[PDB]
Ligand binder design. Structure first.
Ligand SMILES: O=C(O)c1ccc(C(=O)O)cc1
Length: 299
């Protein structure tokens, strides 16, 4: 029979532990363990911008027991930018979006600038010398830095990492000068005074950090850059399986503790149905491609 095999749910996060990509699915997984009695196991599988872990899910059996929980790179973005691809992201089977989260500009608290305009001047004063970390080539932090440079006429050197976690280590350590992270992973550091967020790349401020202005409020209205964390299944996963999984994830997102934890970090829980999720990924893929084009995004 089917029912007599307990099967674990395996969720690959294709980025190092401790960033938002890792934290949000782990928070949610605590509320799914009851429905997957053989266990919910998150594995962090790093490399190639998120494409190593992504490929591993892509090639797994399309039974819904192996899923990718990822930010946009290996779902919507990197196939527009990379020299090659070992899988076809257009064939992901969308399950849901766990959260959307705005990106920010974050610096070390010793950087002698108080706001975005002063940061621009610092970059122009030290042209080609100021370095920006990223979460990897083709991640939203990469493209967000690029959009910033496009809109401001600045020239900064890209230093890609494997994800948020090692980038934040180096920004704290002073080994990079700026990072366009999402708010959720940078907020604890900002609150602690360990890092300093200069602006939020959205049309409104975050309720989690209400005193930090948007980029629009600082003279850069087109500096909008919002990431997200989706769940996708291998190509060919049945529609009713995807639907059942989306209902399980959506149910987790509404649980009070998951709501508290997402809210305190400025992550907006979504839980969108598979169709809406697929429409969103399509629209996002094109939106980020339009950034690649307008901002001359370079590997
Ligand atoms: O592309 C992104 O927005 C993104 C990439 C990596 C991580 C992480 O390492 O947690 C989070 C977000």
């Amino acid at each position: 029979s089917h029912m007599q095999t307990p099967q674990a749910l395996k969720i690959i996060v294709p980025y190092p532990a401790g960033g938002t990509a890792d934290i949000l699915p782990r928070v949610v997984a605590e509320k799914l363990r009851a429905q997957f009695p053989a266990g919910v196991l998150i594995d962090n599988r790093t490399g190639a911008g998120g494409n190593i872990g992504a490929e591993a899910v892509f090639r797994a059996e399309p039974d819904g027991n192996t899923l990718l929980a990822s930010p946009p790179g290996p779902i919507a973005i990197n196939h527009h930018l990379y020299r090659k691809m070992a899988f076809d992201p257009s064939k992901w089977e969308p399950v849901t979006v766990l959260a959307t989260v705005p990106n920010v500009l974050v610096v070390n608290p010793r950087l002698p600038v108080k706001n975005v305009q002063e940061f621009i001047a610092y970059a122009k004063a030290n042209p080609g010398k100021v370095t920006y970390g990223s979460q990897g080539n083709g991640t939203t932090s990469h493209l967000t830095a690029s959009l910033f440079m496009q809109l401001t006429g600045t020239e900064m050197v890209h230093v890609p990492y494997k994800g948020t976690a090692p980038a934040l280590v180096d920004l704290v350590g002073g080994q990079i000068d700026v990072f366009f992270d999402n708010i959720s992973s940078s907020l604890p550091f900002h609150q602690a005074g360990k890092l300093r967020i200069l602006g939020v790349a959205d049309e409104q401020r975050s309720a989690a950090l209400p005193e930090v202005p948007t980029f629009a409020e600082q003279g850069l209205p087109s500096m909008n850059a919002v990431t997200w964390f989706a769940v996708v299944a291998p190509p060919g996963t049945p529609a009713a399986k995807v639907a059942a999984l989306q209902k399980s994830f959506a149910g987790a997102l509404t649980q009070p503790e998951v709501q508290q934890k997402f809210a305190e970090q400025g992550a907006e829980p979504r839980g969108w149905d598979p169709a809406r999720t697929g429409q969103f990924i399509r629209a996002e893929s094109a939106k980020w491609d339009r950034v690649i084009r307008s901002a001359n995004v370079r590997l």
